[PDB]
Amino acid sequence: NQHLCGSHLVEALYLVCGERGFFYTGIVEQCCTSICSLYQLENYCN
């Protein structure tokens, strides 16, 4: 399983893109919906 949402992902993205930064103009419907691999949760930081 290892499924989580909200705060768990917002400080989980720090593990792979802590110093990279994130794009600003929904991650909820893209990552919270199921198990997330690196390629999906790193889409907002690159």
Partner: protein, 785 residues
């Protein structure tokens, strides 16, 4: 004397009670087989007794004896030397009528084990500790009446107790129990006073520091480490005359079984080993050339099933027949085989290994080097027909002459089998029947390829990245990972399987597989190892890849609330107390503590209360099969605070005597603390303020109204709740008025009205929140008649 009898060589009691009675024999020099006593009752076996047998060399065997107990048959037997075992054991009591073992003199079993079993009327066996009795704690005892709990616990008394399996339990008759000696005494023994017996003694000593039995050798009338007279049966020494007399007698007697004793190394051993020659003083001298052993076997075939079978080939260097290893026991039993068979050189016959569960390796053949004179069916000079795991291939030379089996070896890897095939010299002369086809290395693949690139840790998440390895054909089902807590890296793991990332046409721009094990405990350490899975090709077996086990430890976070009471040692001094929190989540750097004061009850300060009275392989293989078909078809060629460390207490002073105080406690593991922990207390007050300041004076009005004058103390935790007033007429009883703050306000002090005429003396006492204080100096008043 300590040995009141001679030897009783090779006793064997069988059939009826006839024979036997062959008394005073302290030593046996052989085994003891009392068995097949089919018709007796305890009446026939109650008065007979042999109380003076103390030393049994090889083993004591009993098999289906109407016998109550051995406590009367062998009341004073101490040690079974166990030089020659029966199967693997020295005490085998097997299969109906009994009361208890007894044998309250037995102390040590040198080499062997105990195998009491299938005695349908046996109990009181789990109440014996074998640690101080048996050299090898690993004693097969099952299928006895004590298993079904039909026998209640009975112990004499009063008797000692030891710890077995973490349980402190008492330690075998109704009148005797174990004789525990101090650990420093070792096998020497001890007396009633605890004095260690002399070192050369064994088990028990008649007097301290001088013996019932001897640890190493006997000599004569004492116990010694080694006889200095110019060795018999590894336990005693005799003169040369006795040894040569036996040697001449048995060859004169033509009795089968004797070994013509030859002196070697000052020992009357059976025969000189491979390397010496027998003889005129018969001292074994080294051979003037090669002297083999060639121990012939029954029809050139023997079964090495246990220690007793291995001892048949001790000292042998050449086996004239075949050998099969058929150890069917749970215990590995590796040391004994090395001693018994390690001196072998080559097997002239064939070799076979079948159902050798106990074996983990095959190193005990420390000098097995070379024949194929005899072959297994199908013309084979070797065999392997579920726990074998490792020869150690080195300069150690093992080559075969002729002959060519490896089946059902789940724990044997393929690489070792192929290396054995190569070093054997069988290259170019083997068929697929010789090579392994049955399951080999099912759980012990031991991939020949190595696998980590990027590691990142967090208090709840850990990231691992490892280099991608592809099989020769881009077959790889994926990667399954195993990781579990390793507190001290002394390595059951969690199992997660991950499919590989998409293949990249450019090796430079590949995607490294990665994983995050989320929700892990902070500060905890774990051990991780990962594995690769490939499709099985029978003619193209591929192991895959392997990664070494690695240990990482999680980062720490805030700890939990400490689990707190405060007790005062003095009026102004208090002592704090608490217990460590439920989970530290890391070594606690310091316990931050605060102190605080809490106010009293404001309402009580003035108010008056004086009133009284294979599933997926076929799915993946089907996908690889199709693409092959497609290409083959569509490609046509051409507040003050303080820190506490490592202490669950503290002292705080300079506080009020009864005012409640508040303590705030923080547990911190970084110098990051936990949420607040709080506790209060109420110290013992002081009575200094409980006493009214200044004595009492009196005034009298015209209407016999009395007014008293004193000063109000406001120190005892604030406003005083009330006063207590006592007055008594001359020669009469006592009377009281409960004066509170309200009455004090109404009458501007304590006043007494309506009292009977006479002479009185009135005293006043303060009553703070602590209690009633000291009384004041009396004052008098009078009421006119």
């Amino acid at each position: 004397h300590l040995y009141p009898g001679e030897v009783c060589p090779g006793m064997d009691i069988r059939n009826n009670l006839t024979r036997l009675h062959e008394e005073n024999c302290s030593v046996i020099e052989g085994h003891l087989q009392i068995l097949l006593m089919f018709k007796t009752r305890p009446e026939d076996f109650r008065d007979l007794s042999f109380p003076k047998l103390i030393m049994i060399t090889d083993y004591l065997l009993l098999f289906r004896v109407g016998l109550e107990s051995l406590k009367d048959l062998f009341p004073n037997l101490t040690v079974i030397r166990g030089s020659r075992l029966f199967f693997n054991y020295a005490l085998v009591i097997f299969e109906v009528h009994l009361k208890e073992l007894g044998l309250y003199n037995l102390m040590n079993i040198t080499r062997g084990s105990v195998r009491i079993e299938k005695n349908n009327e046996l109990c009181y066996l789990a109440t014996i500790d074998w640690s101080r009795i048996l050299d090898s704690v690993e004693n097969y005892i099952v299928l006895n009446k004590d298993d079904n709990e039909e026998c209640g616990d009975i112990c004499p008394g009063n008797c000692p107790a030891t710890v077995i399996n973490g349980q402190f339990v008492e330690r075998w008759t109704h009148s005797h129990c174990q004789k525990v000696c101090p650990t420093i005494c070792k096998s020497h023994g001890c007396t009633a006073e605890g004095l260690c017996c002399h070192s050369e003694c064994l088990g028990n000593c008649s007097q301290p520091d001088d013996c019932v039995a001897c640890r190493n050798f006997y000599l004569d009338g004492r116990c010694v480490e080694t006889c200095p007279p110019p060795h018999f049966q590894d336990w005693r020494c005799v003169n040369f005359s006795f040894c040569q007399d036996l040697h001449h007698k048995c060859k004169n007697s033509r009795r089968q079984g004797c070994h013509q004793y030859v002196i070697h190394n000052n020992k009357c051993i059976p025969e000189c080993p491979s390397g010496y020659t027998m003889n005129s003083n018969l001292l074994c001298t080294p051979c003037l050339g090669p002297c083999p052993k060639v121990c012939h076997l029954l029809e050139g075939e023997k079964t090495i099933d246990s220690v007793t079978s291995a001892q048949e080939l001790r000292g042998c260097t050449v086996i004239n027949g075949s050998l099969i290893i058929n150890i069917r026991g749970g215990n590995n039993l590796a040391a004994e085989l090395e001693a018994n068979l390690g001196l072998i050189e080559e097997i002239s016959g064939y070799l076979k290994i079948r159902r050798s569960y106990a074996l983990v390796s095959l190193s005990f053949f420390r000098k097995l080097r070379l024949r194929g004179e005899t072959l297994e069916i199908g013309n084979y000079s070797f065999y392997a027909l579920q726990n074998l795991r490792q020869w150690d291939w080195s300069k150690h030379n093992l080559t075969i002459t002729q002959g060519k089996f490896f089946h059902y070896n789940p724990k044997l890897c393929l690489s070792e089998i192929h290396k054995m095939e190569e070093v054997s010299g069988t290259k170019g002369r083997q068929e697929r029947n010789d090579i392994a086809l049955k399951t080999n290395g099912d759980q012990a693949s031991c991939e020949n390829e190595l696998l980590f690139s990027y590691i990142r840790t967090s208090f709840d998440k850990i990231l691992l990245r490892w280099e991608p390895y592809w099989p020769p054909d881009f077959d790889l089902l994926g990667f399954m990972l195993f990781y579990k807590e390793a507190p001290y890296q002394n390595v059951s793991w969690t199992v997660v399987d991950i499919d590989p990332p998409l293949r990249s046409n450019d090796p430079k721009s590949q995607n490294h597989p990665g994983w995050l094990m989320r929700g892990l405990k902070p500060w905890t350490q774990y051990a991780i190892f990962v594995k690769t899975l490939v499709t099985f090709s029978d003619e193209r077996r591929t192991y895959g890849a392997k990664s070494d086990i690695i240990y990482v430890q999680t980062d720490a976070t805030n700890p939990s609330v400490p689990l707190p009471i405060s007790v005062s040692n003095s009026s102004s001094q208090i002592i704090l107390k608490w217990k460590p929190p439920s989970d530290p989540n890391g070594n606690i750097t310091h316990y931050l503590v605060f102190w605080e004061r809490q106010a009293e009850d404001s309402e009580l300060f003035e108010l008056d209360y004086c009133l009284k009275g294979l599933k997926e392989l076929e799915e993946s293989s089907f996908r690889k099969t199709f693409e092959d078909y497609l290409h083959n078809v569509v490609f046509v060629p051409r507040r003050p605070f303080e820190k506490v460390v490592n202490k669950e207490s503290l002292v705080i002073s300079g506080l009020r005597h009864f005012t409640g105080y508040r303590i705030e406690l923080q547990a911190c593991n970084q110098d990051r603390c936990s949420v607040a922990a709080y506790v209060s207390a109420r110290t013992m007050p002081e009575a200094k303020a409980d006493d009214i300041v200044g004595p009492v004076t009196h005034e009298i009005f015209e209407n016999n109204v009395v007014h008293l004058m004193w000063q109000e103390p406001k120190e005892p935790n604030g406003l005083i709740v009330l006063y207590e007033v006592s007055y008594r007429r001359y020669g009469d009883e006592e009377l009281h008025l409960c004066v509170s703050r309200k009455h004090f306000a109404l009458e501007r002090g304590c006043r007494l009205r309506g009292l009977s005429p006479g002479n009185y003396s009135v005293r006043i006492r303060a009553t703070s929140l602590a209690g009633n204080g000291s009384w004041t100096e009396p004052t008098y008043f009078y009421v006119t008649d």
